Design an enzyme around this catalytic site. Structure first.
Site, PDB file in Angstrom:
ATOM      1  N   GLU A  51       0.758  -1.052   0.080  1.00  0.00           N
ATOM      2  CA  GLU A  51       0.014   0.038   0.152  1.00  0.00           C
ATOM      3  C   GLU A  51       0.651   1.213   0.022  1.00  0.00           C
ATOM      4  O   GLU A  51       0.240   2.338   0.362  1.00  0.00           O
ATOM      5  CB  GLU A  51      -0.929  -0.047   1.231  1.00  0.00           C
ATOM      6  CG  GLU A  51      -1.815  -1.254   1.460  1.00  0.00           C
ATOM      7  CD  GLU A  51      -2.538  -1.467   2.439  1.00  0.00           C
ATOM      8  OE1 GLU A  51      -3.368  -0.518   2.740  1.00  0.00           O
ATOM      9  OE2 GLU A  51      -2.318  -2.264   3.271  1.00  0.00           O
ATOM     10  N   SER A 105      -4.485  -5.078   2.279  1.00  0.00           N
ATOM     11  CA  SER A 105      -5.498  -4.886   1.282  1.00  0.00           C
ATOM     12  C   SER A 105      -6.129  -6.423   0.677  1.00  0.00           C
ATOM     13  O   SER A 105      -5.768  -6.833  -0.130  1.00  0.00           O
ATOM     14  CB  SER A 105      -4.999  -4.494   0.162  1.00  0.00           C
ATOM     15  OG  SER A 105      -3.796  -4.892  -0.540  1.00  0.00           O
ATOM     16  N   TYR A 157     -19.383  -1.116  -4.558  1.00  0.00           N
ATOM     17  CA  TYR A 157     -18.325  -1.259  -5.770  1.00  0.00           C
ATOM     18  C   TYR A 157     -19.204  -1.382  -6.774  1.00  0.00           C
ATOM     19  O   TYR A 157     -20.170  -1.593  -7.048  1.00  0.00           O
ATOM     20  CB  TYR A 157     -17.473  -2.511  -5.479  1.00  0.00           C
ATOM     21  CG  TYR A 157     -17.017  -2.859  -4.367  1.00  0.00           C
ATOM     22  CD1 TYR A 157     -17.469  -3.340  -3.188  1.00  0.00           C
ATOM     23  CD2 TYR A 157     -15.459  -2.582  -4.221  1.00  0.00           C
ATOM     24  CE1 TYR A 157     -16.767  -3.649  -1.897  1.00  0.00           C
ATOM     25  CE2 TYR A 157     -14.610  -2.556  -3.047  1.00  0.00           C
ATOM     26  CZ  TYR A 157     -15.358  -3.235  -1.825  1.00  0.00           C
ATOM     27  OH  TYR A 157     -14.661  -3.400  -0.657  1.00  0.00           O
ATOM     28  N   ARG A 172     -11.239   3.780  11.670  1.00  0.00           N
ATOM     29  CA  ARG A 172     -12.417   3.563  10.656  1.00  0.00           C
ATOM     30  C   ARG A 172     -13.033   2.281  11.115  1.00  0.00           C
ATOM     31  O   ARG A 172     -12.252   1.067  11.244  1.00  0.00           O
ATOM     32  CB  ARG A 172     -11.921   3.843   9.285  1.00  0.00           C
ATOM     33  CG  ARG A 172     -13.332   3.616   8.259  1.00  0.00           C
ATOM     34  CD  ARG A 172     -12.990   3.482   6.687  1.00  0.00           C
ATOM     35  NE  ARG A 172     -12.700   2.227   6.674  1.00  0.00           N
ATOM     36  CZ  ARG A 172     -11.537   1.656   5.750  1.00  0.00           C
ATOM     37  NH1 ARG A 172     -10.742   2.446   5.393  1.00  0.00           N
ATOM     38  NH2 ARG A 172     -11.345   0.307   5.583  1.00  0.00           N
ATOM     39  N   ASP A 197     -15.299  -0.975  10.470  1.00  0.00           N
ATOM     40  CA  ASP A 197     -16.095  -1.689   9.148  1.00  0.00           C
ATOM     41  C   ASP A 197     -17.169  -2.588   9.529  1.00  0.00           C
ATOM     42  O   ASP A 197     -16.700  -3.598  10.582  1.00  0.00           O
ATOM     43  CB  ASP A 197     -15.175  -2.240   8.068  1.00  0.00           C
ATOM     44  CG  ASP A 197     -14.116  -1.526   7.693  1.00  0.00           C
ATOM     45  OD1 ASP A 197     -14.151  -0.063   7.678  1.00  0.00           O
ATOM     46  OD2 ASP A 197     -13.258  -1.992   7.084  1.00  0.00           O
ATOM     47  N   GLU A 222     -13.806  -5.262  11.299  1.00  0.00           N
ATOM     48  CA  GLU A 222     -12.579  -4.732  11.851  1.00  0.00           C
ATOM     49  C   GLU A 222     -12.409  -3.255  11.817  1.00  0.00           C
ATOM     50  O   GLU A 222     -13.155  -2.449  11.520  1.00  0.00           O
ATOM     51  CB  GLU A 222     -11.463  -5.165  10.612  1.00  0.00           C
ATOM     52  CG  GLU A 222     -11.377  -4.481   9.767  1.00  0.00           C
ATOM     53  CD  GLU A 222     -10.440  -4.865   8.488  1.00  0.00           C
ATOM     54  OE1 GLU A 222     -10.688  -5.586   7.805  1.00  0.00           O
ATOM     55  OE2 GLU A 222      -9.072  -4.362   8.441  1.00  0.00           O
ATOM     56  N   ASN A 255      -9.565  -0.123  11.428  1.00  0.00           N
ATOM     57  CA  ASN A 255      -8.525   0.115  10.548  1.00  0.00           C
ATOM     58  C   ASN A 255      -7.995   1.257  11.447  1.00  0.00           C
ATOM     59  O   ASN A 255      -8.516   2.345  11.479  1.00  0.00           O
ATOM     60  CB  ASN A 255      -8.942   0.654   9.230  1.00  0.00           C
ATOM     61  CG  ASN A 255      -9.488  -0.584   8.494  1.00  0.00           C
ATOM     62  OD1 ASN A 255      -8.666  -1.287   8.004  1.00  0.00           O
ATOM     63  ND2 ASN A 255     -10.754  -0.574   8.161  1.00  0.00           N
ATOM     64  N   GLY A 306      -7.134   5.570   4.805  1.00  0.00           N
ATOM     65  CA  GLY A 306      -6.575   6.220   3.657  1.00  0.00           C
ATOM     66  C   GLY A 306      -6.639   7.658   4.221  1.00  0.00           C
ATOM     67  O   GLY A 306      -8.004   8.323   4.707  1.00  0.00           O
TER      68      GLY A 306
HETATM   69  N1  ADP Z   1     -18.240 -13.292   6.698  1.00  0.00           N
HETATM   70  C1  ADP Z   1     -18.585 -12.709   5.440  1.00  0.00           C
HETATM   71  N2  ADP Z   1     -19.458 -12.698   4.640  1.00  0.00           N
HETATM   72  C2  ADP Z   1     -19.749 -12.353   3.815  1.00  0.00           C
HETATM   73  N3  ADP Z   1     -18.706 -11.416   2.920  1.00  0.00           N
HETATM   74  C3  ADP Z   1     -17.580 -11.617   3.604  1.00  0.00           C
HETATM   75  C4  ADP Z   1     -17.191 -11.922   4.812  1.00  0.00           C
HETATM   76  N4  ADP Z   1     -16.036 -11.765   5.070  1.00  0.00           N
HETATM   77  C5  ADP Z   1     -15.261 -11.045   4.184  1.00  0.00           C
HETATM   78  N5  ADP Z   1     -16.421 -10.812   3.188  1.00  0.00           N
HETATM   79  C6  ADP Z   1     -16.050 -10.261   1.805  1.00  0.00           C
HETATM   80  O1  ADP Z   1     -14.862 -10.137   1.384  1.00  0.00           O
HETATM   81  C7  ADP Z   1     -14.291  -8.845   1.482  1.00  0.00           C
HETATM   82  C8  ADP Z   1     -12.830  -8.799   2.262  1.00  0.00           C
HETATM   83  O2  ADP Z   1     -12.790  -9.440   3.556  1.00  0.00           O
HETATM   84  P1  ADP Z   1     -12.156  -8.183   4.751  1.00  0.00           P
HETATM   85  O3  ADP Z   1     -12.247  -8.788   5.981  1.00  0.00           O
HETATM   86  O4  ADP Z   1     -13.048  -6.727   4.596  1.00  0.00           O
HETATM   87  O5  ADP Z   1     -10.753  -7.759   3.962  1.00  0.00           O
HETATM   88  P2  ADP Z   1     -10.112  -6.300   4.233  1.00  0.00           P
HETATM   89  O6  ADP Z   1      -9.499  -6.240   5.918  1.00  0.00           O
HETATM   90  O7  ADP Z   1      -9.148  -6.157   3.368  1.00  0.00           O
HETATM   91  O8  ADP Z   1     -11.460  -5.191   4.258  1.00  0.00           O
HETATM   92  C9  ADP Z   1     -15.242  -7.810   2.172  1.00  0.00           C
HETATM   93  O9  ADP Z   1     -15.139  -6.795   1.476  1.00  0.00           O
HETATM   94  C10 ADP Z   1     -16.567  -8.775   1.995  1.00  0.00           C
HETATM   95  O10 ADP Z   1     -17.242  -8.365   0.791  1.00  0.00           O
END
Ligand code: ADP
Ligand code: ADP
Lengths: 302, 303
Positions: B13, B159, B218, B252, B254, B266, B268, B272
């Site tokens: 990143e 990412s 998205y 932030r 999520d 999670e 962050n 950004g």
């Molecule tokens: N338990 C879940 N149920 C449905 N979709 C998920 C789940 N976990 C992750 N995802 C999908 O995968 C993507 C990446 O997971 P994520 O934890 O947000 O990675 P990052 O830490 O990079 O944001 C999410 O944006 C989501 O769309």
């Protein structure tokens, strides 16, 4: 293989660290140089460091952080620093950035085992018994679900500093103010009484091996425990060790009261003199002092 | 006051760290210098750092860590690094030893928030709702107390690298193998479907204030406000989590919204910071202008 041992530190366990360093320097089976962090934060290198070791306490240091140390001359760093700026993950974060392999738990594990509130939240969630407690944060009044007596402690300090036993609620506010003198967060846990203190060493990266169980009373090696309880101690220590992702070593302390076990804390950098609990425990487990140090260094490279 | 901005980083990143650093500089209400960490780990100072920002990337640097930088001329350090050696507590730890005030989460909160497994354990223990899950470490056979589908992911990364969706239990092994390519530990959690991703920002030390809630989208973008019927609930959960984890400065948070049920995904610690990034925008809609946000963040580092 050349090893860099860092001892001293700004914490109250400064002299104990130098004692441990004296023991390590005489038995580590590798060429090893000593670096000392004086109580004022400054460092001492080469001769001045050894001189400080003999004195058994270095109040003033020469070089301010970061020191003009020849890091490229070492393959492994052994941070034998206790408490703050030792077991909390800061020195480790530094070593990580230097690209230097080192002995012991990494930043996350160190920072986590050091926080009495966070480590308890993690361990409780995993099914490891811990004393009932509540976290109190500077600025927001306490809410304690159980009744006194309590034991109040700063969440991220160590060396019993700021710790007090509270018998009545009326004395709680003053205990917290004392603890807050050292931390922005404190823990209020149930005071166990009477209680027995057990200690057990663990060695390995994530999936370790437990040493025999010990008891503090004078160190009783091994602890006068029944077969079953002794097994649970080692078992709980290995479980908590794995959950927290500790690397290298840890001395895990438990309280035993009313026949129940409670994991008090994981010490990622325990006393290391040839007569300290951790080394003696493993000596009892068939691992000689020089060999113990050899294994820690080997573990640091894997 | 004099601020020191650190950007770039050895993570993937690196480029985005520089972009948010460009925005920060354009509006930070304090005399500010930039220090860049190239992709090769060497630091670029002075004009070279700004020249680096120019190119939008710094493949190689000049000074190997630790840099011959005059930290004494700075009151606050603003680390804009992402992922490894960014928000994992390593840089933070180094700053703690230099006795230098800095923006954002401390050593523990940073290391903790970057570990999906560990932060989910703390949050669940605290009563904060999270997606069911189990940790899988390299070396032990995976045991999942629930049926698929589910998402598999590296516990400590950046990412969304190494993340996959598994429908058939016979595809779990390959998913873990992929995940273990970025970490020694992985998370296996129940896949939510359909799911909406909400986000709220937080400012302050331990006890912060939530920004309005936005919804991610998205294209074949963030919706501020989010078409919720819940925003309050999301903000309360965010601040509760923020408090328990002891986060400082900012974060932030999520969430996942499925079947009317919220799930914190999670936190962050170093989002950004370009004027158009999710964090700055959310707070803007909350009455906290971009220059003000930066001002407060810098002041918070001192309290
Ligand atoms: N338990 C879940 N149920 C449905 N979709 C998920 C789940 N976990 C992750 N995802 C999908 O995968 C993507 C990446 O997971 P994520 O934890 O947000 O990675 P990052 O830490 O990079 O944001 C999410 O944006 C989501 O769309
Ligand atoms: N919950 C408790 N119940 C009874 N005694 C306690 C409790 N917590 C701490 N103590 C006493 O205080 C001492 C120090 O507690 P401890 O957490 O180990 O401080 P430190 O982290 O500095 O070693 C223990 O040896 C024990 O005798």
């Amino acid at each position: 293989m050349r090893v860099l041992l860092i001892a001293g530190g700004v914490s109250p366990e400064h002299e104990v660290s130098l004692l441990s360093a004296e023991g390590v320097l005489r038995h580590i089976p590798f060429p090893t140089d000593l670096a000392v962090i004086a109580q004022d934060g400054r460092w001492l290198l080469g001769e001045k460091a050894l001189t400080a070791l003999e004195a058994k306490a270095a109040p003033e240091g020469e070089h301010p952080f970061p020191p003009p140390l020849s890091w490229e001359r070492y393959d492994v760093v052994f941070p034998l620093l206790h408490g703050r700026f030792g077991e909390d993950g800061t020195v480790q974060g530094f070593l990580e950035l230097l690209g230097k392999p080192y002995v012991g738990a990494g930043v996350a594990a160190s920072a986590l085992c050091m926080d009495k509130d966070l480590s308890k939240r993690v361990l409780a969630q995993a099914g490891v018994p811990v004393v009932p407690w509540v976290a109190v944060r500077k600025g927001e009044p306490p809410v304690v679900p159980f009744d006194p007596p309590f034991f109040v402690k700063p969440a991220n300090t160590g060396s019993s500093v700021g710790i007090s036993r509270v018998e009545r609620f009326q004395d709680l506010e003053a205990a917290l103010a004392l603890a807050f003198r050292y931390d922005e967060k404190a823990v209020v846990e149930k005071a166990l009484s009477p209680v027995r203190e057990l200690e057990v060493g663990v060695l390995g990266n994530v999936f370790g091996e437990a040493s025999p169980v010990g008891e503090v009373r004078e160190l009783l090696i091994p602890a006068p425990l029944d077969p079953g309880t002794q097994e649970t101690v080692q078992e709980l220590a290995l479980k908590a060790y794995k959950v927290l992702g500790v690397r290298g070593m840890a001395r895990v302390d438990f309280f035993l009261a009313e026949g129940e076990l409670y994991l008090n804390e994981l010490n990622t950098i325990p006393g290391f003199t040839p007569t300290s609990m951790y080394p003696r425990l493993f000596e009892a487990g068939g691992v000689a002092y020089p060999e113990l140090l050899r294994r820690l260094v080997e573990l640091a490279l894997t």
